[PDB]
Amino acid sequence: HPPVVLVPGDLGNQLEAKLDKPTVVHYLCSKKTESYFTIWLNLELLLPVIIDCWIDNIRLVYNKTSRATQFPDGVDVRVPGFGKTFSLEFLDPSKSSVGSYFHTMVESLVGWGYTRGEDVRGAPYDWRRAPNENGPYFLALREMIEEMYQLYGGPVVLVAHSMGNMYTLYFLQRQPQAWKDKYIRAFVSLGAPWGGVAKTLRVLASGDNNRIPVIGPLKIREQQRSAVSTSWLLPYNYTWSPEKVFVQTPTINYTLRDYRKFFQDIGFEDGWLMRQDTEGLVEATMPPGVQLHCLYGTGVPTPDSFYYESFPDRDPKICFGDGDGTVNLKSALQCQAWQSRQEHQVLLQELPGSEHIEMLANATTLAYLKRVLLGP
Ligand SMILES: *[C@@H]1O[C@H](CO)[C@@H](O)[C@H](O)[C@H]1NC(C)=O
Ligand SMILES: *[C@@H]1O[C@H](CO)[C@@H](O)[C@H](O)[C@H]1NC(C)=O
Numbered sequence: 513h514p515p516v517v518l519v520p521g522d523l524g525n526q527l528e529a530k531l532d533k534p535t536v537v538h539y540l541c542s543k544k545t546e547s548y549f550t551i552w553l554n555l556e557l558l559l560p561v562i563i564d565c566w567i568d569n570i571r572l573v574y575n576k577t578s579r580a581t582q583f584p585d586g587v588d589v590r591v592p593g594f595g596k597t598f599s600l601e602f603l604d605p606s607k608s609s610v611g612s613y614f615h616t617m618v619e620s621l622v623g624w625g626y627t628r629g630e631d632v633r634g635a636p637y638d639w640r641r642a643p644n645e646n647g648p649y650f651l652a653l654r655e656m657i658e659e660m661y662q663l664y665g666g667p668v669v670l671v672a673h674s675m676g677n678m679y680t681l682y683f684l685q686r687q688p689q690a691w692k693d694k695y696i697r698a699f700v701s702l703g704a705p706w707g708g709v710a711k712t713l714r715v716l717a718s719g720d721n722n723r724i725p726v727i728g729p730l731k732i733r734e735q736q737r738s739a740v741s742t743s744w745l746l747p748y749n750y751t752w753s754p755e756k757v758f759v760q761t762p763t764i765n766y767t768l769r770d771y772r773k774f775f776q777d778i779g780f781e782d783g784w785l786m787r788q789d790t791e792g793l794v795e796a797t798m799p800p801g802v803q804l805h806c807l808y809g810t811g812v813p814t815p816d817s818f819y820y821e822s823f824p825d826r827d828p829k830i831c832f833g834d835g836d837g838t839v840n841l842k843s844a845l846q847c848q849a850w851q852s853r854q855e856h857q858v859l860l861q862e863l864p865g866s867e868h869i870e871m872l873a874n875a876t877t878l879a880y881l882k883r884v885l886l887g888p
C-alpha cells in the first residue's frame with residue numbers, strides 16, 4: 513500500500529504558543545509563560561472571563577506597509593506534530609470527542625497496516641495564514657513526500673480535507689509535471705471549497721460560532737477576520753457569477769465584484785488588503801496534474817446568500833442551496849472542468865447526505881479510500 517500524507521483544513525490541527533508580552537488587555541491575561549502551551553484546541557481558554565486573552569494571542573496583526581501578517585508583540589505560535597498524526601487526529605490534547613478530527617480515518621489506516629509517523633504522516637500548518645505566508649511548510653511537505661517515496665517504495669497519496677484541498681492544489685500547481693509524475697500517486701480531495709464558499713461573507717460580517725458555541729459570535733469574529741485564510745476563501749468568479757448577490761441590505765447589494773465596499777462597510781478594511789494579497793495564489797483554471805478523486809457532499813442545506821437589515825445585524829436571514837452544509841455544490845463543477853485539461857484521470861464521487869466534517873469519519877468515505885489505497 514502506498515504512503516499517505518494527510519492535509520487538514522481550517523482549525524484542523526493543534527497550535528502552540530509562548531508568551532512574553534509587554535502589555536495585556538485585562539489583568540486576568542497572562543503576560544509570560546516559561547514554555548509553549550496548547551492554544552488550539554484548549555476549551556479552558558475560551559470561557560467568557562478569558563476569551564479576550566485568547567483572542568489577543570491568537571489574532572494575526574496585519575502590517576499594511578509590508579503587506580504581511582505578524583504575531584502580536586511577545587507572542588510566538590508554532591505548529592506541533594509535522595510528520596506525525598497526533599495533532600490532526602485530536603485537536604484537543606485531552607483527546608476529547610469534541611476535537612476528534614482525523615482520528616477515525618487514522619484508526620482505519622492503522623487497521624489496514626499503516627504505521628503512525630512512518631507510512632502515514634500528517635502535514636499540519638498554521639491555518640490562520642494563506643499559502644503566501646507558509647513557504648517553509650511547502651518546502652517541508654515536498655521533502656517529506658520525497659522521503660516517504662524512498663522509504664516506502666512508491667509514490668504518495670495525498671488526502672486533504674476542506675481548505676487543505678486549496679493548500680494542496682497550490683502546492684501541486686507549483687511543482688513541475690515530472691516531479692508530480694514521479695512522487696504523487698493520487699490526490700483524494702474531501703469537501704474541497706474550490707472557488708470559495710458563500711458562508712465566508714457571514715463569518716466576516718457577523719462571526720460564525722457554529723463550530724465553537726462556547727464563544728460568542730462577535731468575540732470569535734475578531735479571530736476569524738484576523739486570519740488571512742478567511743478572506744482567501746471568499747467566492748471567486750471562476751465558480752460564481754459576478755452578478756450573484758451574496759449579501760443584500762435595504763440600501764446596497766454585495767457581489768464578488770464588491771469586496772472592497774463590503775470590507776469598508778463592515779469596518780474591516782484590512783480584509784480587502786488580505787483578499788488582494790491572496791486572490792491570485794491559486795491559478796483559476798490550472799488542474800493539479802495528478803490522478804484526482806473529488807469527493808463532495810450533497811443534500812445538506814448550505815448557506816448561499818444573506819439578508820442583513822444593516823451591519824451589524826444580530827440575526828441575518830439566510831438563503832440555502834445544495835452542498836455539504838459548508839461547501840456549496842457549485843465548487844464540485846471545478847473538478848469537472850479539470851477533466852479536459854489534464855491527462856490523469858479525474859473521478860467525481862457524490863456523497864449524498866454527507867455533512868462537511870462528518871464525511872471524515874463516515875464509513876462510505878473510508879470504504880472509498882480503502883479502494884484507492886489497497887486496490888481491491
Ligand atoms: C511593518 O513592517 C515594516 C516593514 O517590514 C516594519 O518596518 C515595521 O516595523 C512594521 N510595523 C509594525 C507595527 O511592526
Ligand atoms: C476574476 O477575478 C479576478 C480577481 O479575483 C480578476 O482579476 C479577473 O478580472 C476576474 N475575471 C472576470 C471578471 O472575468
Ligand SMILES: *[C@@H]1O[C@H](CO)[C@@H](O)[C@H](O)[C@H]1NC(C)=O
Binds near residue numbers: 760
Ligand atoms: C440586488 O440589487 C439589484 C439592484 O439593481 C436587484 O435588481 C437585485 O434583485 C438584488 N438582489 C437579488 C438577489 O436579486
Ligand SMILES: *[C@@H]1O[C@H](CO)[C@@H](O)[C@H](O)[C@H]1NC(C)=O
Binds near residue numbers: 874877
Ligand atoms: C455517510 O455518508 C453517506 C453518503 O455517502 C450518507 O448517506 C450517510 O448518511 C452518512 N452516514 C452518517 C452516519 O452520517
